[PDB]
Amino acid sequence: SRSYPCDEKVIAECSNRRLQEVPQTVGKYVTELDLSDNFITHITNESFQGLQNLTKINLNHNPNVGLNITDGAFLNLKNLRELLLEDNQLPQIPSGLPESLTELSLIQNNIYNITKEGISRLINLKNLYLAWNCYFNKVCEKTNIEDGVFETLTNLELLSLSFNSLSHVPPKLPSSLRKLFLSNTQIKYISEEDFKGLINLTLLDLSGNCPRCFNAPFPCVPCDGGASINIDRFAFQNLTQLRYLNLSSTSLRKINAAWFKNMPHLKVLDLEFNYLVGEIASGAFLTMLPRLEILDLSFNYIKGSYPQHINISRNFSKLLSLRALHLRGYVFQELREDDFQPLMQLPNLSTINLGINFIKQIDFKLFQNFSNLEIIYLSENRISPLVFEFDPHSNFYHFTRPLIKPQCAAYGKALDLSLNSIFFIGPNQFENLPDIACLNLSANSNAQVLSGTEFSAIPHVKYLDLTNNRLDFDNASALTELSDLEVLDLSYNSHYFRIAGVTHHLEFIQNFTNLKVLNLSHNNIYTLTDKYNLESKSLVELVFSGNRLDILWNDDDNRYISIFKGLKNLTRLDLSLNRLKHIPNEAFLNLPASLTELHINDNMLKFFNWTLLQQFPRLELLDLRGNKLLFLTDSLSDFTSSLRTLLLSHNRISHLPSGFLSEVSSLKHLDLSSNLLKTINKSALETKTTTKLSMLELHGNPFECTCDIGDFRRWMDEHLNVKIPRLVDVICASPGDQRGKSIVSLE
Amino acid sequence: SRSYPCDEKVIAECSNRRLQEVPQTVGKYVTELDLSDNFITHITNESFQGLQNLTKINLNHNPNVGLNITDGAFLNLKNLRELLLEDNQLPQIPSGLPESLTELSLIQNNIYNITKEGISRLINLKNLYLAWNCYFNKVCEKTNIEDGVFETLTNLELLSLSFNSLSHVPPKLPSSLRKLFLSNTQIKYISEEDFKGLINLTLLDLSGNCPRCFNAPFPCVPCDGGASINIDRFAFQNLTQLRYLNLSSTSLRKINAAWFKNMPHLKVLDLEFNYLVGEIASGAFLTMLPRLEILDLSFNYIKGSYPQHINISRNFSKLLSLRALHLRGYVFQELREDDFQPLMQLPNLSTINLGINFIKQIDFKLFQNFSNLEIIYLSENRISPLVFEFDPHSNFYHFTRPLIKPQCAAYGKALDLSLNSIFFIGPNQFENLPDIACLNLSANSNAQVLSGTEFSAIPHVKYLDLTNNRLDFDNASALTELSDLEVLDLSYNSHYFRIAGVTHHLEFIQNFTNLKVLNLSHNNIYTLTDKYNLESKSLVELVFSGNRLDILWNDDDNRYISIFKGLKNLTRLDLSLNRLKHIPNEAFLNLPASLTELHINDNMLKFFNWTLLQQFPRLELLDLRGNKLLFLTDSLSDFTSSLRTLLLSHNRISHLPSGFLSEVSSLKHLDLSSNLLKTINKSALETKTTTKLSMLELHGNPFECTCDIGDFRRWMDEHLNVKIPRLVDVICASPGDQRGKSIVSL
Ligand SMILES: *[C@@H]1O[C@H](CO)[C@@H](O[C@@H]2O[C@H](CO)[C@@H](O[C@@H]3O[C@H](CO[C@H]4O[C@H](CO)[C@@H](O)[C@H](O)[C@@H]4O)[C@@H](O)[C@H](O[C@H]4O[C@H](CO)[C@@H](O)[C@H](O)[C@@H]4O)[C@@H]3O)[C@H](O)[C@H]2NC(C)=O)[C@H](O)[C@H]1NC(C)=O
Ligand SMILES: *[C@@H]1O[C@H](CO)[C@@H](O[C@@H]2O[C@H](CO)[C@@H](O[C@@H]3O[C@H](CO[C@H]4O[C@H](CO)[C@@H](O)[C@H](O)[C@@H]4O)[C@@H](O)[C@H](O[C@H]4O[C@H](CO)[C@@H](O)[C@H](O)[C@@H]4O)[C@@H]3O)[C@H](O)[C@H]2NC(C)=O)[C@H](O)[C@H]1NC(C)=O
Ligand SMILES: *[C@@H]1O[C@H](CO)[C@@H](O[C@@H]2O[C@H](CO)[C@@H](O[C@@H]3O[C@H](CO[C@H]4O[C@H](CO)[C@@H](O)[C@H](O)[C@@H]4O)[C@@H](O)[C@H](O[C@H]4O[C@H](CO)[C@@H](O)[C@H](O)[C@@H]4O)[C@@H]3O)[C@H](O)[C@H]2NC(C)=O)[C@H](O)[C@H]1NC(C)=O
Ligand SMILES: *[C@@H]1O[C@H](CO)[C@@H](O[C@@H]2O[C@H](CO)[C@@H](O[C@@H]3O[C@H](CO[C@H]4O[C@H](CO)[C@@H](O)[C@H](O)[C@@H]4O)[C@@H](O)[C@H](O[C@H]4O[C@H](CO)[C@@H](O)[C@H](O)[C@@H]4O)[C@@H]3O)[C@H](O)[C@H]2NC(C)=O)[C@H](O)[C@H]1NC(C)=O
Ligand SMILES: *[C@@H]1O[C@H](CO)[C@@H](O[C@@H]2O[C@H](CO)[C@@H](O[C@@H]3O[C@H](CO)[C@@H](O)[C@H](O)[C@@H]3O)[C@H](O)[C@H]2NC(C)=O)[C@H](O)[C@H]1NC(C)=O
Ligand SMILES: *[C@@H]1O[C@H](CO)[C@@H](O[C@@H]2O[C@H](CO)[C@@H](O)[C@H](O)[C@H]2NC(C)=O)[C@H](O)[C@H]1NC(C)=O
Ligand SMILES: CCCc1nc2c(N)nc3ccccc3c2s1
Ligand SMILES: CCCc1nc2c(N)nc3ccccc3c2s1
Ligand SMILES: *[C@@H]1O[C@H](CO)[C@@H](O)[C@H](O)[C@H]1NC(C)=O
Ligand SMILES: *[C@@H]1O[C@H](CO)[C@@H](O)[C@H](O)[C@H]1NC(C)=O
Ligand SMILES: *[C@@H]1O[C@H](CO)[C@@H](O)[C@H](O)[C@H]1NC(C)=O
Ligand SMILES: *[C@@H]1O[C@H](CO)[C@@H](O)[C@H](O)[C@H]1NC(C)=O
């Protein structure tokens, strides 16, 4: 039978299915099993029956906004390798866990007592996550770790105790440890004996102990007087394998060089949210880190201080392996050439992160002198013209996304000037720069008329982001100096397009021989001056969303009838959010014959002429989601041989015509979800020549469940080739007796 | 029995009800019937037969998407005065219209032929609207106007022919004409005999004839060469009563002063979208308008020309009665004191409009030397730091809305600097200005830290609009120099608020003795430094929408639970668009006790503690719309004696608890629309006292039309005083036979 309620594909995915009990309906060879997000309020020896090969179970957030597991529920398994209990409001570690477990996550529970009766028999444990049980203003109790609880686990590699009230590094920790997470534990003092016996440690996280609480975006309790963490100079002595060390928000004003004496493999050092300005300026510790790749010094600013310049010690010149340097929230006015002199001969330093410094001015010519910089991140500054709340599985101190969009960075050397003040680009702005492939000028409040001379000193820009400005496109030669331009993002430039009475000029689009992708979204374009057509021989993708094609294509106006025809290479066109009630036949027929993909979604369409699809022989995806459409042609096979994906969700369709679904041979993905369908006839499904369809989305329709759905329910069993996602969401709305029942639950 | 399908109140509003045809169910006392925006295809002599009392009928836009009207269909109606048929795709003026008609609207149809058989029989016509039949790129025919068609309408005071192709003014127009609209008619030439007989004309609209087509946001056909309209020197001679004249977009280059020799009453003169820069500079015609109140000179710019200065003729000093001058779209770089000299002795000139000129700099002291300027409109320029597509019923050339928001302007002198470049306000920025009550700094890209000195030169601002900037609130004394400040709008300053690691200070709010209305909307406020509370002893209304209260009030954080409690005078509070799935009990309890009106609408709320309304004895309106709420209490009368309006629309409410409609004695308006209610049973109706509800909104609920709905239908008949609106939209879901039908119809 069709897999229900789980999607099996060997893993079974039951997540977020509103299950009130563990499924007895589970498969046979099911191994990975995810029950997360369901409503299960009870667990037992009965609920899991017994099964075969299960190598994993995810019980997370059962139920959803606790859980009762009786002593010895998971008991007879012996196969159970990994078990995830997060967010179930557990007052205690469940008594009677299996001996098989190598992975256990108790994260985000009420467990205040870690005891031998819950743990010490777990000898096979590899990774154990106890994080986020007692923290912030949560009413909770100090965490008691029984003496030698972890001592019994001689295979233990990772241990995470973070965001719990500890006060001391637990003693008698197994020497097999690789990674140890102590973050935000209220530990004031680290002694010589705390970490002494762990010679295999590659990671130690002490962050958030004695935090720097000024301007905290969370409840923050400092050590007495706002004191630094106290780490004995021999604390790290036997730590020879250490790679990652997280000292963030330890309130450090001084860093003992002797900490790093026995730590030759050190790679990533996190010093964020401390008071390190002095140490950054002088910094004996910098001499001790020859293999260090990533150094994060972010948010060390002196409160209320705004110095003219940043003070970097010459000892930075001794990190020979340095790859990225993060200095955010240092807070200084100006970056001069000599200030970065110690970084310039570092062979591997490809990334400098200057975000959120309120920097007014920079001598850009310094970046040239650097050995090889790939990413120059200046976002969120003052640069002006040249003259539960926290993801427990994520880094708490800084975001992990790429600094620069990967699609932009792949082109080459990237300069990100976003969220600054450069409101006018003057003739010398970009002089003395490296050869910039990827440039981000977004959110500079730029109101200027780009004339074609502005980027001439960096003529090689491949990918240009001008989004969220005020640009006034009054010149046909704008941006044409960039010959190699490939991607251009003009989004959120609506300021001038909105005013009927100012001139508007898009003609520059045609000059580029390499332009591939162009984003005109959210510009409110309803009118252009003298040239109504967009023309490019190169252009591949055009994003036109958030404009007014309802105005451009108004029935009484023929000037814009051809607006997209001149893009002769175009395979992808996004027409969404143009407030279209209908598209004039002529206008639709004037869309490029080359189109493989067309998005009309989230308009007001009450009419669509299906016949017109005959003029688009390469059309693959047609996206009509989020409109008002009632009508479906019964003829589709006559208008397209190429259609693959058809997305109709969030429309008004109450009727599938006889011979609709299966008569298009090329159709794979059909999306009927969130429509008005009361049923599906035997006539809708035929099938003379078999359907290539691999996916059919029916969820969120008011199916009337009587014997009239019998044929569809029959069709589903006869085609298991066709998957209908979210079976738990394909639901009888009628009659009153069957309400809420899944369509496959009907007998 | 309540009225249906119409809402009778005597007029019937039947509009937008999806009617297939004229209802028979309309009351006989009914005078005016509005059938606009329905699905009715066919009008015949039996359509309105049951109604002889009809005076005014609105058939506009039927069907919604042609309309077939038989000959003499409306004939049997002896009392019909006003007949509005617009957007009906009518091929002809309907035959045999009743002679009683005073007002006829044929706007926006396919009628290309104006004939005696349709028009000339109606002697009582006052207003006749023919506009927008053949225009733009529409496929349409040139308009044939039969010689003498209007000659027989001796009562006709208004004729609108605009947006048709006339090619010349119709001869033989009646002398009763007051207003004549000829806009966009393709009339090249106005002769001396075109208007010679209209001695009662108050308004003449000649606009859009020989239009200026450069950068037009509509299909535009210029006269050959782009020539000016040709108006004979004597064309206006008998027009002595004219008040309004619209010459916009006639491609005028010179204006013949002689045209105005005979019109001593001229009040409003529209010259927009012409070639008039030369005239604006010399301008003999200004000698001729001592009674002109309103002069629109907008968009006379020379294409491609960005002169340093605007050049205003000294003859502007001859307009003694001028109230408002509109100079948009002249396009010049710098405004100097000397440039406005001729305007400065004009006693009544309250409004100056400089919008969309790309002005770089203004010598601001010039505005004082004017007699009295109430409104200085500088919006949409380059000012930097100091060193239906077309609604046929509206004005085509400019918007008619007030330049300044009336709520601001009412405080006093207004300066609107919005949509400019003043990104940093310097010490002298506002020097030598008049005493400014109403100030708009919106969308200036301002990133500065307001420190408390920036407004020192205009300390009397009572309404300040700071919206749509980059403002960095890093200083506790910000804005405190304005001690009379009543209204402060901070909307859309999110730039810095969204960065967790920069300091944020809202403490300045408390200083104001007179602060009434503060709008913090759409700032994405999730974190503050030090002071976590908003405090004011004055503030009446706080708009907090579009922030993150969901983060501020997060269960693990105690810091913001008092956030609004220190606003002691607070009555209206808007919590909408905060992504709230629920409000902690103590945080709700910490809302100001004085609230009359509380909006939590358009959040994610899954939960509401109704018992908490006990602490709000003044609470009148509670707006819960657009949430997830399932629950309502059966005890509500225990928790409030004060609740008047309760808005529950767009939630999931499966059932009403027992006697809910009779529960609260203060409750007048209850909104249950757009919910999951399948029935209202005997229980919701069961209680000792009676419903005092004057309104109950049920529309959009999936009602079950089986017999058990009958009980609620009796409750309806019992109380006719309880208004349930949109009854065509209160609709049976189950079962299939009754589906699509109003529950009132079963
Ligand atoms: C102090 O500084 C140290 C740095 O030394 C930080 O240590 C890191 O902590 C983060 C956050 O917990 C870790 O990130 C997480 O890693 C998990 C493990 O992944 C490893 O193994 C898997 C195999 O399953 C690989 O896929 C992966 O590449 C790694 O090899 C991931 O499971 C986590 O994934 C997260 O996102 C994905 C979605 O993209 C989800 O599927 C997950 O559920 C989860 O949300 C996450 O990436 C990181 O590994 C730690 N570093 C090291 C070297 O171990 C501390 O976090 C920091 N302390 C504080 C308080 O900030
Ligand atoms: C202006 O308009 C352009 C539109 O072109 C936008 O830029 C594009 O942004 C879209 C995101 O909407 C990008 O498309 C996405 O790329 C992701 C990254 O792919 C890279 O890496 C993967 C492997 O990890 C490679 O397969 C790929 O070749 C790239 O190297 C994909 O992961 C995304 O997939 C998502 O949708 C697909 C289906 O399409 C699913 O299969 C995925 O599960 C996932 O949901 C997606 O394809 C696109 O790359 C961007 N183009 C450019 C030129 O940058 C701008 O964002 C827009 N500006 C604004 C302000 O909105
Ligand atoms: C050339 O220049 C002249 C100015 O001299 C313009 O003439 C004006 O044209 C506009 C647009 O038609 C007229 O505005 C409309 O007036 C209607 C009549 O209002 C009278 O009656 C009402 C109530 O009885 C009074 O309140 C009012 O004072 C008048 O006595 C209104 O009904 C119209 O309102 C419409 O829109 C509004 C707002 O959307 C709605 O509230 C209404 O329901 C309705 O839909 C509208 O206000 C104006 O009256 C004309 N001026 C004069 C003095 O007569 C020309 O328009 C201009 N030419 C072009 C082509 O732009
Ligand atoms: C930041 O927040 C502020 C404060 O809320 C917003 O400013 C308010 O905006 C609202 C509308 O959004 C204004 O309310 C409206 O006022 C109109 C003016 O009414 C005056 O004049 C009429 C008669 O001429 C009198 O009846 C009245 O007492 C006033 O003297 C009303 O006409 C409006 O009423 C209509 O709509 C409302 C529903 O909104 C109904 O209640 C009415 O029955 C009627 O249908 C409306 O009440 C309010 O006056 C503004 N306050 C101030 C101080 O200006 C800002 O807009 C906001 N900023 C941003 C960017 O959003
Ligand atoms: C300060 O200046 C700004 C910018 O000019 C003013 O904002 C503008 O206000 C008008 C009038 O409210 C807005 O137009 C309106 O749109 C609404 C929303 O649909 C519509 O119902 C009205 O018919 C009206 O046309 C306009 O959008 C808005 N412009 C921008 C860019 O926001 C603001 O009013 C000024 N402040 C004061 C105190 O006057
Ligand atoms: C240029 O900089 C802007 C602003 O920093 C980047 O915009 C961010 O993009 C990511 C991905 O879309 C989002 O998570 C953020 O919401 C955006 N920030 C804001 C506030 O707009 C943009 O991605 C950058 N462009 C390139 C080419 O990397
Ligand atoms: C408003 C009339 C037509 C005009 N459009 C523009 C524009 N888009 N940018 C400018 C920049 C500088 C100077 C003038 C202009 C003008 S003048
Ligand atoms: C990032 C550390 C804390 C800071 N917050 C701000 C702020 N809101 N505005 C500034 C304006 C100028 C200079 C410095 C600042 C800083 S420094
Ligand atoms: C720099 O990195 C490269 C690999 O990217 C490596 O071969 C080289 O040894 C590194 N240089 C230093 C000094 O670490
Ligand atoms: C574009 O700008 C340059 C520099 O101002 C100017 O020389 C050129 O004439 C402009 N081109 C257009 C289309 O006006
Ligand atoms: C059309 O698009 C493809 C994909 O970008 C590209 O290979 C080809 O060069 C383009 N053709 C032209 C003429 O630009
Ligand atoms: C605010 O800025 C002013 C500058 O005039 C300064 O004097 C004051 O100290 C600042 N206030 C605070 C408390 O930050």
Ligand SMILES: *[C@@H]1O[C@H](CO)[C@@H](O)[C@H](O)[C@H]1NC(C)=O
């Ligand atoms: C409280 O509100 C009213 C609003 O009209 C106002 O009259 C009164 O002065 C305010 N009280 C204080 C102390 O500001």
Ligand SMILES: *[C@@H]1O[C@H](CO)[C@@H](O)[C@H](O)[C@H]1NC(C)=O
């Ligand atoms: C409502 O809030 C108060 C807490 O102050 C409590 O007495 C009552 O139980 C709450 N109701 C619910 C359902 O939580």
